[PDB]
Design a protein around this ligand. Structure first.
Ligand SMILES: [Mg+2]
Ligand SMILES: [Zn+2]
Lengths: 282, 83, 712, 452, 234
């Protein structure tokens, strides 16, 4: 027999992990609410990812760049674990150039302004004295998983390498419920939903986006449910007053009250009388 | 009559077609001959109308002549003589 | 319905889609249409869907053991490259999803399309032509789920307990909607017995009569049902006019109810009911909580003591052999019998200790998978393992698969498994050859006329009497008596006519006959049909697949041949070689001499070849049987065989297998028909396969259609 | 698998091959598996998988196919490989270089041209309509016929490399051939429904359905299960060893530590040292017959140190509580979960899907060919004929025998009717029957047909 | 983003108070997400009035039957439980129904105080005969969902007070399913089907609207934390 409104609270455990408490709820509603939130978070949270790459010395994914111990395919797979955050919807190109003996990571890639890389310490490849890596990554927004778009679909050349895209900043979402189940029927379900993201968006913001998406469809479910004064054949003083000052139609006169029209200086008593009788008439 | 609305190919219930005909083979020949006549009428309709008559029931948007014929049989609109 | 790959359907329906897209002005001509079809332009799938719509297409899986191995369906377009089959037709196709592939064929003209969509529609083929039992049964997972949903658990949460003095029974629900609300809450369990008020389901016959009187318009009125929520849901799944069942539903129970539905309900409604049952069973299988883990399989605590006792017995018999009191064969026989006793004791202990809620026992008992021999081999001990010569190794496998086997134990198990894997491979080809011969010999007969108007028939025992006086039901009535036609009127003690001539003789007719008290019933069969070519419909009887009388153009011979040849691979001379020799009419290996005249017998134990003399009870002549082997025992009849015991004209004096030609020449054609039918039926049923007698009757009739000329 | 400074001894693995990890054979992947039934999508040995296996490229294979074509001298001259193909469009020649061979790395699909080869045909019988077309479109001589190399119907992919053989460059070739070209095409095939997965205990199965990651059972920690197998196939087939492997794999993945506070437990008495404490994601070896005992594995399941926070997802008997990904309610009973080794077999549906409407035919008899090498055509055998006769449907059998296989005029007329919209015409006499009649006549047998 | 279309709901009625709703087309995988939450919200969010406890004179500890009428205590409790009421006040209202002699005691002989209504007086309850004297006191209060009977606190004051289960929710039975229509061209979205059966107190359309505002304000409480959010347009 609970009638108070539900409430939301947040508790951060880490920069990525977080724990949101929803309470109170109707008995049995917690499991369904948590499941719906998790299903939306894991699938329909927009993000950004790299879709196509290009190395100068290769033509397809099944070659090998000379001088680097890494293979092209396994370089692609290593690049699969890159997390980013873009602010521009259009495709954006970033560059990675390295030369000499060293371990090239995600910290040697220059992002153009307006986008952010977030895991620069991750390993990409290892070069030698003769090694030389030069790659270009094109990045777009999106949502969910989109497979590699065919090269012939766009006007891409031979060198372009399409790559699978995973726009999903949500990493791991789960939930639990605490049920009181008391004998006075003040029984409620407290939902505890813990969310972890891949360091690309606050789980707070991820749940904000999920909530907006949900309220979209649920609000869809909701919405089911004139004449000129001179034409009145007036006189000298009234005509002069309306001409010099600029009162043209009887609409403004019927909108203006007697106090609002008598404020004018050198106003005539005959003008007051005629305006009163004519507003009484029409 | 206790069944729900049939879906797709079984839209005319098979039993309701059975009691209108002697046997399953007779029903098959029924439907095949009617579909042949309907297809001939559809193909030849541009020229002078021959003895074949078009569908007696209202055809759907793009309905097969066989299904149109089966609907005609269910509606009890044709008569046949056996061999 | 079946799901067809979109590329596969596009290639199959290429001319259709090409003509349609040319008509829709998407292409100027056939060349451009072909070009865009080959390049798979986006404007192809939209017209492909319309082309595919309600165009029957027929699937088939090799080998086609019986008629139901190739069935028509209405296809859809599904992204992917694998054909999506309905789970219910898997039993009919003998198809499993371990990797088996299927083929698809397209009927083109109106005749072929109508034939496919009328005769070959899957929803039009539920019952098996061979045995009448429906082949659209809920299979493993579905029966497991339905069993879990239907079983009643005593002392469950939310049960009904009558109370007074302080509170009412607090277990009675006003409506299934309220019951569903309670089950949604934690108060009520699905498998908890309660009392509910039902307003839609017809109650069983007894309560319906005793409550509503003559008029049983129950789906309008309301009544009280003492049952579980799962049974209410199952009855809601069932058609509205069906009476309430209120019983835990085994595989046999589901078979019985589906057979009754097919018997007295339309084909469309029974197909829809089967679909609903499949959906509900699949939904409830997951929630049954049935899974296998290491702790699920349990071992009997008494296993070690039982094994030690039987090992002591084995040591005693081994010592007795070592003393010289018996030979190697006797030692092997003694060890085999004592280890069989040990296996039986271990299995009994495992069954007694094993709980009734464990997933393994639930699966075994529900009728889904395996059986208790598999359960005992898994947990317990496997027992005797066959030698490559077919004998039994004296030392069995004491351990089980749960505890792991030893090197030699695995070696002998591999021996047996390899022998089985070779024999099944040979048996497949043998059964194929047998069914090819059967169909080639029996393709002649078809139904040619409605009735041949004959009077001669066949005598059926139909639940013979008992010495104390009662009608004990004959174990095999659905095979012989069911789905037949009366040859003569049935009368009890020259009184009222129970069932009239020319009746289908179904369940009510058989029940009425048993109530009247008559057993020997005259029937009409193909063995005595008077039609010159083929057989008439009435003599053949009711078509055993469609549930009604056979049509006037059915290929009954081909149907019978397929029905007999289909279960051959299940057989394992007392199996497929035995039935092959029976159908080839060869002289049996165990040639048992047959009597030639009703008379007194005299038997002398000869020099390993006994001498038998039959003296006729009339002015006949003494017949003699001399050249026999001492290996064959003495046939029992009446009791036991005794010297001087007067025997009939055709009494089998020796156990084994009599000669069909001899039994024919000494007892006419009717007796040889009876002998052949009974022998084939018992050979088939010794493995667990039921086949109606009319198929073997057709084959035997085709067998006995000739005569050998003596004088020119 | 080595570094730039590490020392290696004789016999040490330096590089791993196709199915090798760190120098040991690895034919599959470790997948988190639940062994409960699910909605019938795993019914009758079917297998359910998560979409993360498609996403993370857990189960993907590289398949390389080669295509060969040769230029050989003929009685009319010498066929040559050239990008100048008569009466062809310009867009289709974009991927062909000046040599006439598809450029390396150019994406290719079904129906395209790999090698541009043309042969000297000169001219044949030109029908009046063809003469009119040639003389109205102003075509030149078009003296040659283009039997160029095209990709087989039913596959696509990228181009890896090209090897060119020519006798003008000292290369040895079979007599009569002056040029040989082989083109390598590779496809990064992904896992999909219809593919055959298997374990190490004979528990094979096709992929019934690939589920979204959100709509799958997940433990209390929130990790979804990767693969779901039916529970009805284990007890019947007697392969409990797969469940034993599942339990041991979960134990190895989670790690373990036997608490030797007051001596080692009785079940761990004979257990070898260095096995009482295993870090997460450790690797253990179980010899086939001197393997891990049931009591030892039970104890290892008992000591199953938590994953990240304090939580033992798997209880003592190897089971766990799973949350349904569709309805969200917890599953009523715990189900067994673990880690199992799953391998992708070479039974990909891409190599088994086949369909045919009209293709080539044999010479002696006009039946369609067989096999995916040609365009195929299904075998309607004697058993299928028996089933057709048992059904009583004669027209479909007559069609499957006459106008789909043998009757040539029947085939032509049925195609014409099916394109023009009219009904299918009457079937004729099969050509195989006439072939049999002529064969019987050739055996000095006077066989004929009488109309009355 | 954009869902490439406008997902819409279409309702068709089957009985006087029973409807089928089709919501189509959604993003793939959203059918279950909407259906389960909608079913739970319908079942246990709609406020409504229901009977909680009864008290019938003539029985103190004998629970088998009552004199005069032939329907026993359990059956009469069933009939009173299957009765629809509507109360505009939160505090528990008390109803009295009394009848004498033979007759068909229905819901029409009940007397509701001001502010409370009975929406189907033509409900058979009891069949009195042979100087039958029926007097029933009912407690009606407003809640939500389904509530099992609670042990009475006023046992000493009211010994004959028998508590009964409360059907607070106006809806009776709601079920749902999903389908995968338009798979090839429209890249396999899904459609959701709801079947709702409710009492005559409220209709399915406004029942769905009520579940709607419950869910909308719940998720708006959830979302009204970062107003700048990215989602989908209708
Ligand atoms: Mg299989
Ligand atoms: Zn007859």
């Amino acid at each position: 027999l609970i009638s108070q409104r539900p409430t939301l609270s947040e508790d951060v455990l880490t920069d990525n992990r977080s724990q949101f408490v929803i309470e109170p709820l109707e008995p049995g509603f917690g499991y369904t609410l948590g499941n719906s939130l998790r299903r939306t978070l894991l699938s329909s949270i927009p993000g950004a990812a790299v879709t196509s790459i290009r190395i100068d010395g290769v033509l397809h994914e099944f070659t090998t760049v000379p001088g680097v111990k890494e293979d092209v395919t396994e370089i692609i797979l290593n690049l699969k674990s890159l997390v980013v955050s873009s602010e521009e919807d259009e495709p954006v190109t970033m560059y990675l150039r390295k030369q000499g003996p060293g371990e090239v990571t995600a910290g040697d890639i220059v992002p153009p302004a307006g986008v952010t890389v977030h895991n620069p310490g991750m390993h990409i490849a290892t070069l030698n004295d003769k090694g030389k890596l030069e790659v270009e990554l094109v990045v777009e927004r999106g949502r969910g998983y989109v497979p590699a778009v065919q090269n012939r679909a766009s006007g891409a050349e031979i060198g372009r390498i399409p790559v699978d895209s995973i726009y999903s900043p949500v990493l791991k979402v789960t939930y639990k419920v605490d049920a009181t189940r008391v004998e006075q029927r003040t029984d409620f379900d407290k939902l505890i939903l813990d969310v972890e993201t891949k360091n690309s968006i606050s789980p707070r913001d991820a749940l904000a986006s999920a909530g907006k998406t949900l309220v979209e469809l649920f609000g869809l479910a909701r919405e089911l449910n004139a004449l000129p004064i001179d034409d009145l054949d007036l006189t000298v003083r009234s005509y002069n007053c309306l001409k010099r000052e600029g009162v043209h139609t009887v609409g403004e006169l019927v909108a203006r009250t007697e106090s609002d029209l008598l404020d004018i200086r050198n106003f005539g008593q005959k003008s007051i009388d005629e305006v009163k009788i004519k507003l009484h008439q029409l | 009559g206790g069944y729900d609305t049939p879906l797709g190919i079984t839209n005319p219930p098979i039993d309701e077609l059975l009691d209108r005909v002697s046997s399953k083979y007779a029903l098959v020949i029924y439907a095949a001959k009617r579909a042949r006549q309907i297809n001939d009428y559809y193909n030849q309709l541009g020229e002078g109308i021959l003895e074949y008559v078009g569908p007696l029931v209202e055809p759907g948007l793009q309905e097969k002549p066989l299904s149109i014929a089966l609907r005609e049989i269910h509606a009890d609109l044709l008569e046949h003589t056996e061999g | 319905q079946c799901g067809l790959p979109k590329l596969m359907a596009l290639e199959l329906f290429k001319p259709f889609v090409m003509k349609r897209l040319v008509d829709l002005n998407h292409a100027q001509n056939i060349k451009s249409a072909k070009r865009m079809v080959e390049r798979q332009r986006p404007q192809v799938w939209d017209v492909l869907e319309e082309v595919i719509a309600e165009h029957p297409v027929l699937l088939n899986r090799a080998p086609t053991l019986h008629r139901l191995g190739i069935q028509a369906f209405e296809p859809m377009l599904v992204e992917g490259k694998a054909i999506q089959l309905h789970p219910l037709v898997c039993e009919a196709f003998n198809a499993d999803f371990d990797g088996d592939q299927m083929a698809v064929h397209l009927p083109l003209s109106a005749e072929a399309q109508a034939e496919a969509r009328i005769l070959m529609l899957s929803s039009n083929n539920i019952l098996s032509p061979a045995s009448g039992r429906p082949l659209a049964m809920p299979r493993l997972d579905m029966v497991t789920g339905l069993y879990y949903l239907t079983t009643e658990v005593p002392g469950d949460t939310g049960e009904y307990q009558p109370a007074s003095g302080d509170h009412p029974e607090t277990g009675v629900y006003s409506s299934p909607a309220e019951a569903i609300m309670a089950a949604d809450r934690g108060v009520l369990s699905v498998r908890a017995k309660i009392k509910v008020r039902l307003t839609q389901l017809r109650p069983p016959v007894e309560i319906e009569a005793e409550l509503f009187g003559h008029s049983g318009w129950q789906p309008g009125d309301a009544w009280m049902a003492e049952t579980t929520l799962g049974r209410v849901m199952f009855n809601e799944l069932l058609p509205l006019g069906y009476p309430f069942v209120n019983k835990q539903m085994h595989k046999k129970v589901q078979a019985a109810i589906i057979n009754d539905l097919a018997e007295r309900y339309p084909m469309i409604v029974v197909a829809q009911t089967v679909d609903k049952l499949k959906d509900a069973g699949f939904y409830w299988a997951t929630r049954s909580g049935v899974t296998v883990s290491m702790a699920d399989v349990l071992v009997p605590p008494r296993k070690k003591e039982i094994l030690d006792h039987y090992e002591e017995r084995a040591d005693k018999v081994e010592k007795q052999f070592q003393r010289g009191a018996l030979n190697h064969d006797e030692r092997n026989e003694a060890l085999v019998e004592i280890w069989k006793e040990a296996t039986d004791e271990v299995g009994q202990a495992l069954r007694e200790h094993y709980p009734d809620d464990n997933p393994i026992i639930t699966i075994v008992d529900s009728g889904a998978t395996g059986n208790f021999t598999q359960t005992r081999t898994l947990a317990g001990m496997k027992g005797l393992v066959t030698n490559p010569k077919g004998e039994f190794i004296p030392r069995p496998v004491k351990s089980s698969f749960r505890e792991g086997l030893t090197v030699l134990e695995y070696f002998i198990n591999t021996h047996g498994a390899r022998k089985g894997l070779a024999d099944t491979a040979l048996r497949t080809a043998d059964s194929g050859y047998l069914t090819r011969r059967l169909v080639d010999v029996s393709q002649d007969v078809i139904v040619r006329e409605h009735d041949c108007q004959t009077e001669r028939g066949i005598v059926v025992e139909l639940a013979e009497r008992a010495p104390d006086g009662t009608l004990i039901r004959d174990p095999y009535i659905e095979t012989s008596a069911y789905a037949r036609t009366l040859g003569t009127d049935a009368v009890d003690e020259a009184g009222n006519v129970i069932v009239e001539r020319g009746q289908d003789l179904g369940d009510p007719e058989i029940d009425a006959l048993l109530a009247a008290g008559i057993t020997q019933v005259k029937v009409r069969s193909v063995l005595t049909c008077a039609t010159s070519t083929g057989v008439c419909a009435t003599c053949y009887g009711r078509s055993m697949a469609t549930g009604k009388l056979v049509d006037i153009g059915e290929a009954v011979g081909i149907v019978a041949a397929q029905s007999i040849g289909e279960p051959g691979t299940q057989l394992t001379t007392g199996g497929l070689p035995r039935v092959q020799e029976l159908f080839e009419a060869r002289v049996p290996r165990g040639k048992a001499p047959i009597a030639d005249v009703t008379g007194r017998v005299r038997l002398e134990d000869g020099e390993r070849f006994y001498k038998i003399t039959i003296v006729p009870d009339d002015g006949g002549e003494e017949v003699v049987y001399d050249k026999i082997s001492k290996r064959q025992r003495l046939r029992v009849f009446k009791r036991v065989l005794s010297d001087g015991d007067h025997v009939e004209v055709g009494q089998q004096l020796m156990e084994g297998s009599a000669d069909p030609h001899e039994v024919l020449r000494v007892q006419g054609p009717r007796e040889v028909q009876i002998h052949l039918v009974r022998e084939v039926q018992e050979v088939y049923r010794a493995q667990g396969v039921s086949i109606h007698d009319k198929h073997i009757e057709v084959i035997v009739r085709q067998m006995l259609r000739r005569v050998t000329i003596i004088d020119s | 698998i080595v570094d730039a400074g590490d020392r290696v001894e004789a016999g040490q693995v330096i590089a791993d091959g196709p199915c090798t990890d760190d120098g040991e054979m690895a034919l599959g992947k470790n997948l988190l598996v639940a062994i409960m039934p699910w909605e019938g999508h795993n019914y009758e040995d079917a297998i359910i998988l998560s979409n993360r296996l498609v996403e993370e490229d857990v189960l993907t294979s590289i398949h390389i196919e080669e295509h060969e074509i040769d230029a050989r001298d003929t009685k009319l001259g010498a066929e040559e490989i050239t990008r100048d193909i008569p009466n062809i469009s310009d867009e289709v020649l974009a991927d062909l270089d000046e040599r006439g061979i598809v450029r390396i790395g150019a994406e290719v699909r079904d129906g395209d041209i790999l090698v541009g080869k043309v042969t000297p045909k000169g001219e044949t019988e030109l029908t009046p309509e063809e003469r009119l077309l040639r003389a109205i479109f102003g075509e030149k001589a078009r003296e040659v016929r283009d039997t160029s190399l095209k990709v087989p119907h039913g596959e696509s992919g990228k181009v890896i490399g090209i090897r060119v053989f020519s006798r003008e460059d000292e290369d040895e070739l079979p007599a009569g051939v002056n040029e040989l070209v082989r083109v390598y095409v590779a496809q990064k095939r992904k896992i999909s429904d219809g593919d055959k997965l298997a374990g190490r205990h004979g528990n094979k199965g096709v992929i019934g359905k690939i589920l979204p990651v959100e709509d799958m059972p997940f433990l209390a920690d929130g990790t979804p299960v990767d693969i779901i197998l039916n529970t009805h196939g284990v007890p019947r087939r007697m392969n409990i060893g797969q469940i034993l492997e599942t339990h041991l794999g979960w134990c190895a993945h989670s790690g373990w530590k036997v608490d030797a506070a007051k001596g080692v437990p009785d079940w761990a008495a004979r257990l070898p040292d260095e096995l009482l404490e295993a870090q997460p994601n450790a690797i253990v070896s179980t010899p086939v017959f001197d393997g891990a005992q049931e009591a030892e594995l039970q104890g290892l399941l008992s000591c199953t140190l938590p994953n990240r926070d304090g939580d033992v997802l798997v209880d003592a008997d190897g089971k766990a509580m799973l949350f349904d990904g569709r309805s969200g309610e917890p599953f009523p009973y715990p189900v067994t979960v673990g880690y199992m080794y799953i391998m992708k077999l070479h039974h990909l549906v891409d190599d088994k899907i086949h369909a045919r409407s009209t293709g080539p035919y044999s010479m002696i008899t006009q039946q369609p060919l067989g096999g995916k090498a040609q365009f195929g055509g299904q075998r309607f055998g004697e058993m299928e004929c028996w089933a057709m006769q048992a059904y009583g449907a004669a027209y479909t059998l007559q069609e499957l025998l006459t106008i789909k296989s043998d009757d040539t005029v029947g085939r032509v007329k049925v195609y014409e009717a099916i394109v023009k919209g009219e009904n299918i015409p009457e079937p004729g006499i099969p050509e195989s029957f006439k072939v049999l009649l002529k064969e019987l006549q050739s055996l000095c047998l006077n066989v004929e047909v009488l109309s009355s």
